[PDB]
DNA sequence: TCAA
């Protein structure tokens, strides 16, 4: 039988491109000891360790690196009768995928889940850990994206008279799509209802009837928002399924503790069978949102794993002092240091060094690590670059570190590794994250960004350049400054000579690779960047990976979206002063919804008493005061500032451990409050209002001159 | 210069 959906990572391999420096051939005469061998070898990839040899892709008892994987290539390696009971689990990341009832027909899913994916549906996967350290995926069914269109405008443009009509019109526009990428679409793929809402822009704007349209897939939604009736303004078509799951279930969070519970008709979460697992988890469940609750009182982070890594590269062309380029076959990765920490206890658990060629670490370095009370390094030796890179990616899949760190890993180390795997070796990456295939594993340039499904990448270079002012942000300099530690260093121009000289000299390169990763680990546990990022994720209502890589706008957008829905609004698609701009927004009740550009909008009100009027950018603007209508931006700011004041009142009486968590929380509220002015001012952003931004600066200027 |  094997897995329901195919695993796309390598579980077997029997031929590969063998690339290796000729200088590793100790018996060869000097003329044959320069350059790189490059050819295809009919062999299983191998790793050597401490005199022993293994195939890289063999899973069994005697492995050279740790594993946290149940399945490998469709074989279950858990003990006989392994069946943990799961009540509470922590979520650190949320995936969003499409499933089809036809694809899942062989999996023994209950009918209530199959209905939610018939003929297709969006599944929300909560990625997490139990208190016992078991890796969990909880697949939540029944979440649908939805958008709005004005009822009268649709009724005149498409001649609709009942909601069923619009479902046909949309199905037609998809059937008629270029290349027929939306073959098989029908009115069953849709639901439409009539609801009363107000456009969030302007004070005079009246409530109106809208079609709220539900859809099964973001692929369909993005086609409709780009192509269906361009003359008709869409509302909230940009909102992802994760955001709907979080906002439509009061209290739910993208990072935190959850509990499984009985649903509405006493329904339960169903454990998946192993051959229906979508991820590299120990246990997986199908559930609906009513099977979930936020677990109160639990606050400790569970035993997530942090990988801290650094690569070392050697240029192989006619100038070994040229900077290495991944696209050149001869410019090799030669070493990868890889430190594995428990993120809850901060303890270093494993020190792995991957090495192209034999490598004997200095006794000096081994003694120092032993004196520091750290794990003895395991050196993994490879005959070729491919075998080493495959082994590293195999470790990433099998150990599955939830958090990954390093220095310049986003701008250099991942881009270099992934370019080798993709361009030189033709390896598919979509199975190497948490998902077993078809997952996101992507690098792109702006400096760079990364998305790996189920892996939170945190580059320490970004953290430190944001936190500390320094002349130089080289790691050696940062270390001297922040950790008061003066390490010894190898330059890129030492590496060619050390590499050619022999095993002991390649050992010196490894010592340096390991001490580099040890310093970065110390930086990480000093600044605790996962705690500030998770505090922002919880406050903003977005996942921690979106928190790192997306901009400031999505944080304010998601909070505004929550409040706007509660108030009946919908969002259309596109001496010193303490907190000057937030406090102007609050004191003057400035908002999208309190603004008027027209005098007749405020003719029923009294000037000064019921509204501000102000000249801004040459135009007369009106803002009604809070007793007429309270600003959404003002409410956000007020509630956040009240929350921050509450948190900071508790810090002096709290435990030394609690004080850290509270400090990260109060800091998260500051960064979000300060981004509100900016959010209004980004032209072509999410929900721009340049009138509000320009009013804030006009008031600010006048306050200084008044003072 | 800075990224190996
Ligand atoms: Ca390096
Ligand atoms: Ca690095």
Author numbering: 59 to 504, 512 to 639, 716 to 848
Task: Give the published text.
The HSV-1 DNA polymerase, encoded by the UL30 gene, forms a 190kDa heterodimeric complex with its processivity factor UL42 protein. The HSV-1 UL30 is a family B DNA polymerase containing a 5′-3′ polymerase activity and a proofreading 3′-5′ exonuclease activity.
The 1-bp mismatch active site closely resembles the exonuclease active site with the 2-bp mismatch DNA. The side chains adopt similar or identical orientations, and Y577 adopts a double conformation also in this structure. The DNA in the exonuclease state active site is better resolved in the 1-bp mismatch structure as compared to the 2-bp mismatch structure. It is, however, shifted compared to its canonical position adopted by the 2-bp mismatch structure. The 3′-terminal base of the primer adopts a similar conformation and stacks with the Y557 side chain. The penultimate primer base also stacks with the side chain of F381 in this state. The coordination of metal B otherwise remains the same while metal A is lacking two of its coordination groups.
